[PDB]
Amino acid sequence: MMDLAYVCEWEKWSKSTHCPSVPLACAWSCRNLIAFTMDLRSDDQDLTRMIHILDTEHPWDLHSIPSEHHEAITCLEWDQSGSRLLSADADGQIKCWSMADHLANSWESSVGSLVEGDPIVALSWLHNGVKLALHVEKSGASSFGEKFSRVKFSPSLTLFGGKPMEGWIAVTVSGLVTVSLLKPSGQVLTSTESLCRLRGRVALADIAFTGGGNIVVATADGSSASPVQFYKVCVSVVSEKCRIDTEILPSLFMRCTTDLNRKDKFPAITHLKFLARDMSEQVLLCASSQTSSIVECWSLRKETILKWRILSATNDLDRVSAVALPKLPISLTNTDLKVASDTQFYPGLGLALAFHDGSVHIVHRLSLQTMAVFYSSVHLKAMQLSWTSLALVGIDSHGKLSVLRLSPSMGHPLEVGLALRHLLFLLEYCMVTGYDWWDILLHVQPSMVQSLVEKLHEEYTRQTAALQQVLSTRILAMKASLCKLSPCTVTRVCDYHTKLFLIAISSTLKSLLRPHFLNTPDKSPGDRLTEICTKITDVDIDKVMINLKTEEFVLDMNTLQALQQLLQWVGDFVLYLLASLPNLRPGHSFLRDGTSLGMLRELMVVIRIWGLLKPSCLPVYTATSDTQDSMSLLFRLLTKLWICCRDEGPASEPDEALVDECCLLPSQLLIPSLDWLPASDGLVSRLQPKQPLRLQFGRAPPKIDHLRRLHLGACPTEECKACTRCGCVTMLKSPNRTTAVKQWEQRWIKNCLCGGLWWRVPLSYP
Amino acid sequence: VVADVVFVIEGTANLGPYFEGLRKHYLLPAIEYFNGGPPAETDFGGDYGGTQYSLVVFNTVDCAPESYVQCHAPTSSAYEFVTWLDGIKFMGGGGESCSLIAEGLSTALQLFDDFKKMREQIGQTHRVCLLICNSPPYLLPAVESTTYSGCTTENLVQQIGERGIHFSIVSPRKLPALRLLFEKAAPPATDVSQDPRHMVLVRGLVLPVG
Amino acid sequence: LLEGTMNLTGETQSLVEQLTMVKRMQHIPTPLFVLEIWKACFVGLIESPEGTEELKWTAFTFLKIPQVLVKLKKYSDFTEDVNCAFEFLLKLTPLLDKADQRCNCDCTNFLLQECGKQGLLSEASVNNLMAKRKADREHNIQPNIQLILRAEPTVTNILKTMDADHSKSPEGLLGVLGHMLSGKSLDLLLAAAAATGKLKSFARKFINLNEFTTYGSEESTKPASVRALLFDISFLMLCHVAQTYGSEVILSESRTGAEVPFFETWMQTCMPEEGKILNPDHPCFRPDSTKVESLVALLNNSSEMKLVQMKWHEACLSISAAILEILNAWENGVLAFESIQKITDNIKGKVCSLAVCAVAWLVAHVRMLGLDEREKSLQMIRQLAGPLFSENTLQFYNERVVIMNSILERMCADVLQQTATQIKFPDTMPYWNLLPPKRPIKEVLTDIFAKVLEKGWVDSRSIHIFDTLLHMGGVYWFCNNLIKELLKETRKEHTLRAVELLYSIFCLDMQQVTLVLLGHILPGLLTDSSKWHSLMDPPGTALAKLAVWCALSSYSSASTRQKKRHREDIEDYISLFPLDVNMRDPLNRVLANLFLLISSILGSRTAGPHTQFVQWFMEECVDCLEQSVLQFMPFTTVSELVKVSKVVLAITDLSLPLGRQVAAKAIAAL
């Protein structure tokens, strides 16, 4: 089934007049960023040469790269990761945009190719040899090695090791092909060579890869009564330079020309597409007249040894205006077809076909029979499915950009356990890879959320103890983003983010202490500290601090001073938690977690040691007495709380002595305030099924830096980045470049702790 | 003498602040010892006989869709190697303490196999591998490597220790796991640490004693 | 020079309409006009390559151009002007001497006698012109001009005598046809018939002869061995016509009843042309299974010995399946190479058309194959197109071998270009494979346009490369790059020359080029705020002239690639130009959209170079017109144009009863 999640339109910047339309490009990355071009056409033609980057969770904020492309942008293409964007226009000029300062709002291209005057008609990154297959029939198999498995693919152009080179290959409207190879250094090698000796028109082209490191490029000249020719390209590096070796493959003609009843209709091949890059053996063609069209699937299969035979074809359609092929790499064999028909799993078996009326058809891969139909109620000039293929984005024959959700069973009603197992399978696939799971949260209903969270934790267990290491913060981010979606579970998300932050501090503080000499070896001083704090249950802080070799815990008294704000957050969070004990609030989960309270104890002990070395590093508490040791008071109450939960099989409810002592804490100290990270402006909580949000671009339907705990003003003067998932704000450049704890600041250069990207926020100027 | 030098560096936030100090004290002198006298702009690549340097930089698992190891092709210029050591940006990390040492070592093994297919004018040369790390290894077997997939760090460091590769560890923070791996990579059959905090164990190569 | 190079076989009325158009656009005096016609004809004759093109150029200058002048005289004191132009020409002694060295005779004498015969020139004018030419000239084989001028009456009389099969005497038909197959005689007849409009009737005559000789009648060996030769001669000359002068002279254009001839269907579905690639497993190449086994048994019997009744159309349609089974037998290995030699000799020996049909299917089949799979099938062509099998030839064997080697050259050339394979039949393909192998195609375009500007005229080879680039990069790329190369000129002289050349270059596909020009290039130059510094006065006046000449010539209203490609093309001009006579004809839509843009530019603030451009565009719309492109002008332009600065009203209004009111408003209130 299909629901419009939202429709984002330009405001007053439509009504392109007196200059005709142009074809659009669209590219959905692995991270959820849409790069697309549109026909704005207001006071400049550079408004048709701007590349809009739209983060799919905050669509109002649309970045607009002013690409310096003198003709119209033919192709956009994200990386195998999500970090670079290739854009090529007519008259050569492939540009490779990369992020500036790891912001998803600042792009700049330093590298590019140029085959001047020849329009680029196909463009692709080279293949890096990673390919995995999804076994849906092993969805319950309780190990991620059985569900997703790598399929032994070889990368085109391996260079001195197992390591693939990165680079692109483009195919021009003449017979020319060009390969550019990026070195690990900034150098770039280009080579162009004709495809075959008979130089001819290439009006449509496409690029797939094979096992064996061969590119397979298909050319057509649009005439639909002329053959769709095929070339095998092999890249090599000869001693300094790229070298391209081409070879003709079996061409195909097309049915509806041998129909002999009325063969003259459909005279234009309008789309040529391999079914997926790295699936080079099947080809989807789309012949079209002015009003009607035919799509066809062909396959190379051998018996003339190799020979293109048809698989299927549609009967007759409207004129196909756009085509989107899926990206989810299903395993495609016969048992998996059977089990995905039985358990109605349909995410990887669909193509979307827009038409010149409003309709959109999601149609089968192998035998092109229509699986679902969505009537727009004007046509989609560009479509793109997502990487989990649960949502398709599309740009219309107006300014409108819409995101549709496709249900994983295509509208046929499933019992709740099957829907749970489908969405859990996809979230596990996004967990094993690093892809974003936002499109999945389009499909999670509130009433199932809690059950889904349970299943995640059960799948976080029973993996093989290294997967549990590498999937920790990913499953905390997925747990928080799932628990955002339901009113029963909306309270817990703050806890999860502080849990991330706690670990992010804890390890780093245990990273900073370099033991000056190895006493009691084979245990690093993080582990010595944890052992000593877990065996010594003394309520005083002095008695714990005595037994901890405190000539080891030494820093240079410069970074030790610069750690002040993180230590301030530690002390303030401990005090807030203990004062919150007598009362569902931002701290309710931590009171019964023994492990986090142990971590808070360990940080209070190392804070005490560092305070004895230098007293300026300590947090400050405004005390309503002057003969007070506030750190020892909070440590006494923390040990008395933690001994409740460090028991084996305990669940000890806290006794009344702790309750009255923590009632006395606002009398003795002032509980300050705290900032809680997920300032929720995400759409997925705001959306509802059967109701689409109609947004305008740029309309957007106590300020702290959350990572370095600096208080910005009322209206902050220094500029900031915001995370795109959690929403934490940091200032962009560091305040003191000399005194900067780079062990802490350099962790969050490329991402946030939750995982999302940074995104530059504009200043207010009130 | 002829040397096949491979550096394996952890490109994460830890080793971020300490790298500049390590380079002046240990890495830069080690390159000079292989290349007598400091390099300046006259050294040319392309002599397939001679000393050939290489980098392998690895990462943790937080660079989630990006690749784990960035390898550089061999160079005969010590100067290009110095520019590569300047060009590393240490941006990674997050809420973790470990890193992917198995990946860096497996690609170092593939480097040494391609070196062994390269140099046939000499049967065996001085095959030196350094590991500049600040972090204990993960428990993951190696995933993004061919012919060394499914191997832990102990198995790979055994294969480094046999076949006569001289394995060294330079770490700015003294650690138990790194010492255990060094003890394991024992070649078949001196205090070099200028700073007391630094842990430097060099099976092969000569560094001024401090 | 374009009409000489591309369509010799075009009708003279289209050329007269186009030339009168060009004479009205830029106001050309009649003596300079006819002088440019003669100078173009002679220059194109001198620069022609030796072979068929030289015969075609001699026909165009000697026969088609004199007829064109006669039509101009009727449409328009023409004799005084053509006599003036002939004196203008007779001053140019080096051109005429270069031509006379190529003509091997004085060609000006034949021109003056021919224009005397047509009645362009008075006789006294002819005689004093020949006296002047002889005085300036003073300082065994017949030449081709005499052959052509005498061969055109033989074209008419051969039509009228071979209507009746030489009173049904096939021996006579064979002798006369063998005399035609002799050297160059066929080409002379075809060049004369093409230049004089009678190629269609000639093709109908040989096609009807072919239909008559398809079946045959009860006969002994001697009468049938004549009838098969008649099939060979008619077939090979029809293939040579279709490969030289295009295929559309072979088509019947209306066949009442289903009885389309054999050669028309064979050419439709089975013969490679330039833009036609064939499907080897089309249903045309799979007629039966019954007849093809009879035919492979026939080819494996011996010398046919059974040519007495063959139904040659059925045989020629079945050879494709026959050699397909032969190829499968050789790919399995069940047939030896030596039996392959026997089968190829039985094909190519007695009748040569069988080799042409087999080679056509072989070319389709090799074009579909991969690289490594081709090696066997190319050997088949090497045996089918090899030197002559001897000692059982019927009659006229060497001449049929020569014509067949030419046809097989032009069939195989593309496939044997894909893989470097030399078959070496012995120039006959003078303009073929012109582009460099690796160079990007804009460098080709800018170099050829630079050389055409520095000469001042367009060559024949340059016309062929411009055609291949228009076919290859498409219309938009072509027109945009040529207009860019216009707009970076800085001199008045070079800009005006570049525009006068670019109109003729765009006359390859004028209609589509006008749609791209007035729809995509000009609105993108007028709407973009950074672009209009390119619209300065030197190149800008020239560009406005070219746009209005293109608009008028497309309104008042041509190559075979362009016909195929516009039949290919699908576009919705109602959707491209939404617009806020028919108005579903796209040119009216482009013109209405452009005039809306021009009114919007004139009405706005921020006057710059683009306002000067739309001023110039409207001024040459006024000046170039006789009276209509300006029927699409919005009536608010009448008011606004004199707000931005008489006749520019009174011409632009098109004079309806409401149109007088807007006219009288603007003219009185200047």
Add this chain to the structure above:
Amino acid sequence: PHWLLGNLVSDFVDTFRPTARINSICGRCSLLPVVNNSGAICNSWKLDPATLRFPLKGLLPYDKDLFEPQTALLRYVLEQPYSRDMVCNMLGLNKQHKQRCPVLEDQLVDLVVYAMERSETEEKFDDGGTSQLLWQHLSSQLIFFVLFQFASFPHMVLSLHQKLAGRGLIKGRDHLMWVLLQFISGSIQKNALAD
């Protein structure tokens, strides 16, 4: 011109086309001297040392080729033996003052890459075959022009590297190395090695 003047000035300069047409030696780009070492240079062949253009009297609209750098004349003169003083009299070189004349340097580089191309054609059908004679004359000529710093060594070498980069010109690289050896062996002691 400015967009407000426009035709008013441009057409005006076009009416000075015939006067310029009077004052042009026709076919001046394709007229070549016979190089004699005698001195007493006719001032017709003098070029402009900055831009390799013919020095033109007035500001008229001359024909489009007369504003191009005359490289054909300079390459024809540099290919001749004993055209040493004639190239100095053309480009105004003086030998009391060293200058690093750039267009001379680029013409010498293009002469070297032309010799490399013509050596890579065959060079083996005819043993003399004008190739090794050209390389000997290139040795002598280029020694003189780099030795007095009218051109410079390292810019010449790296521009030569940019011309030969990727063109794949390898059959007579030994001759090019020989010519470079003549420069280095001539002047290693005078300059620093970084040159």
